[PDB]
């Protein structure tokens, strides 16, 4: 990447490691997990790091295990503004044949609904865990080979581990390392026209298949042509200088100009597209400080404070009740409050004196002496001290 390293060094990609020996990096070829990404209006990323766009309005199949049937994911697209070139995601439906043949549904908020029943988070069933992440985004985790992300305003993600190498099929592709075969319709033949690929995965026949995927919706709204240039010109400005040599910015720039000209409010469409880039720069190692009072700094409530890179392990009051559990989480970005204060259910965060206990799910107050005949339990400062 245009800089020198001495011999013997070992720089590491996200995927694997490489070592310099005789002016030639030696590298391993061990597989590493993929990420299908939905975001913005209609902007997809396959597992094989392909980018494209398909603005159809039906229930499309996003992903599926296709040699066995451990799961299946189903996106549901709708038009999302006055324009016709604005088709955002409303909901996604997950299906686990391993447990009851159930049917999870991530709704347009941060809500989840199993089999029609709304649910309070967390949801530790046997395999699948569903919990908030920053208290503004849901995260499904089935087993150790599947993750998800929030489908409230339409930024679905997935994490498929290499045990699914090449054995999945959908809009997101085969997950085989080859970027070119991803336009493979279910009839087993690669299509060159994206307008044919997506409309082959629709689940309903009544839905209208589209004939052209447009590239410049700023023609129908020439007022936003100027603003869409200077707005996402910061994406190539040196504010993001640190991760041009980590991921190609040229598409994340291409997906901005389609979002800012198309959606109802180009304020947040702008600031949900710049974050699509920083969230990928951060997935490789580079964190960027791109927030300003002008460039969309979020408003953490009075109890909380903004924070760039922090630990979501010692935040929630449920942590003190279950301390022995492992938190093998990263250094995330969001709204926290200082280390003396821990997060309460009612939005405020409090010291650990009035931090309640969550014994057996039941929310006990900071001083609750409590006993059957044989056991003896009390809540001191977040933890539930039981005896016998």
């Amino acid at each position: 990447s245009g800089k020198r390293y001495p011999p013997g060094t070992s720089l590491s990609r996200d995927c694997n490691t490489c070592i310099c020996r005789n002016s030639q990096w030696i590298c391993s070829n061990e597989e590493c997990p993929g990420e299908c990404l939905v975001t913005g209006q209609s902007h997809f990323k396959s597992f094989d790091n392909r980018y494209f766009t398909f603005s159809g309005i039906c229930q499309y199949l996003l992903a599926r295990d296709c040699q066995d049937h451990s799961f299946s994911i189903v996106i549901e697209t709708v038009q999302c503004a006055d324009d016709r070139d604005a088709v955002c995601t409303r909901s996604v439906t997950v299906r686990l044949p391993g447990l009851h043949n159930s049917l999870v549904k991530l709704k347009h908020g941060a809500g989840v609904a199993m089999d029609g029943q709304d649910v309070q988070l967390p949801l530790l069933k046997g395999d699948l865990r569903i919990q908030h992440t920053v208290t503004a985004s849901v995260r499904l985790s089935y087993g150790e080979d599947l993750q998800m992300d929030w489908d409230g305003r339409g930024r679905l993600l997935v994490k498929l581990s290499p045990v699914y190498a090449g054995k999945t099929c959908g809009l997101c592709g085969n997950y085989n390392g080859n970027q070119g075969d991803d336009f493979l319709t279910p009839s087993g033949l690669a299509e060159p026209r994206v307008e044919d690929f997506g409309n082959a995965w629709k689940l309903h026949g009544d839905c209208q298949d589209l004939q052209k995927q447009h590239s410049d919706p700023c023609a129908l709204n020439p007022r936003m042509t100027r603003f869409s240039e200077e707005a996402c010109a910061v994406l190539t400005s040196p504010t993001f200088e640190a991760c041009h040599r980590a991921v190609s910015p040229l598409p994340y720039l291409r997906n901005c100009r389609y979002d800012v000209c198309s959606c109802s409010d180009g304020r947040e469409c702008l600031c949900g597209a710049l974050a699509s880039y920083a969230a990928a720069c951060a997935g490789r190692g580079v964190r960027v400080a791109w927030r300003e009072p002008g460039r969309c700094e979020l408003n953490c409530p009075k109890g909380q404070v903004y924070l760039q890179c922090g630990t979501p392990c010692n935040l929630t009051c449920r942590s003190l009740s279950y301390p022995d559990e492992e938190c093998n989480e990263a250094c995330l970005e969001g709204c926290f409050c200082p280390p003396g204060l821990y997060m309460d259910e009612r939005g405020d965060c409090v010291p650990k004196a009035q931090c309640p206990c969550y014994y057996d799910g039941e929310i006990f107050q900071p001083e609750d002496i409590f006993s059957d005949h044989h056991t003896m339990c009390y809540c001191e400062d977040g933890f539930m001290h039981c005896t016998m």
């Binding site: 038009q79 016709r84 020439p222 007022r223 936003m224 100027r226 707005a231 180009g266």
Partner: protein, 323 residues
């Protein structure tokens, strides 16, 4: 025919290409006309708060003349003088009223002294355009097809589908105005019902009926004779529109403003004629004829002599020279 006509006359009112009126007190920019499959141009109308300001023509991606009630025609952000002729858009004044011709692209916009947008548009866009002035078809009932494509019964949420925002201002859904007329009714409907009625009674208007119907025009006036206090002149905006709408159909009317007690506003020296030629013989002009076979246009002009010189009528004896 081979042409069309839209009009945004008076306050908040609209007249599409096909005999369909309504009211709309917008809050921001909105699309008047323009293609729908592919846009070579787009005529745009900015509203401050119900009352209109500017007409705008964005010629694809690269150009934007900005005329308005403000009259100080600007472009992009740099205020330019007037006349102006860049990119095949002659921005002239005709009959004391401002014009924006685009004959290469197939449209002729203009504004009057009071502020009344008008859009004459060719038959090349028959069945093609869609916007706030409706499609140019024969029918007049289907011409609310939203930006998605949806025949809507409401004349209001339609016009709010065709909104277009910028970076300087993002705009929301305007609300229909809460009419104060509903309590201040009084005598105002009894004595003033006649100025709307004289579209039907008087003989000078009693002959466009086989061409148009005044029933919408009388319908749209009676709701606006009630907010203005103490004036018969409140009827002549909805009436002035009826004059032009019959003129465009191929049957012009004459001398209707003699007894109507309302003449449209114009600067000093001139008053409202009817069917004056656009090629006004001015002072610093070349005495050439039989090239201006254009159709006849309404607007205010000078007296019989009193040639034009820089926006004022001056006597032919005092024609200056230039160097």
């Amino acid at each position: 025919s081979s042409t069309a006509r839209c009009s945004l006359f008076g306050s908040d009112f609209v007249n599409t290409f096909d005999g369909s009126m309504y009211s709309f007190a917008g809050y921001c920019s909105y699309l008047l006309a323009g293609g729908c499959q592919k846009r070579s141009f787009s005529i745009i109308g900015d509203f401050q708060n119900g009352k209109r300001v500017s007409l705008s023509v964005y010629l694809g991606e690269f150009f934007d003349i900005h005329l308005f009630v403000n009259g100080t025609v600007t472009q992009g952000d740099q205020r330019v003088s007037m006349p102006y002729a860049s990119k095949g858009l002659y921005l002239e004044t005709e009959a004391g009223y401002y014009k924006l011709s685009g004959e290469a692209y197939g449209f002729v916009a203009r504004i009057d002294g009071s502020g009344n947008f008008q859009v004459l548009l060719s038959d090349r866009y028959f069945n093609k355009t869609c916007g706030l002035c409706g499609n140019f078809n024969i029918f007049a009932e289907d011409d609310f097809m939203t930006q998605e494509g949806t025949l809507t019964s409401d004349p209001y949420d339609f016009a709010n589908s065709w909104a277009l925002s910028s970076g300087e201002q993002w705009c929301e859904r305007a609300s229909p105005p809460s009419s104060s007329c509903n309590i201040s009714s009084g005598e105002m409907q009894k004595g003033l019902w006649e100025q709307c009625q004289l579209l039907k009674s008087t003989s000078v208007f009693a002959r466009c009926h086989p061409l148009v119907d005044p029933e919408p025009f009388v319908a749209l006036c009676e709701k606006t004779l009630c907010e203005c206090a103490g004036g018969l002149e409140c009827a002549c905006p909805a009436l002035l529109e009826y004059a032009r709408t019959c003129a465009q159909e191929g049957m012009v009317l004459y001398g209707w403003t003699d007894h109507s007690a309302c003449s449209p506003v114009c600067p000093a020296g001139m008053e409202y004629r009817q069917c004056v030629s656009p090629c006004a013989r001015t002072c610093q002009s070349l005495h050439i004829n039989e090239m201006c076979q254009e159709r006849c246009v309404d607007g205010c002009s000078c007296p019989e002599g009193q040639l034009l010189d820089e926006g004022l009528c001056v006597e032919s004896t005092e024609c200056p020279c230039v160097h």
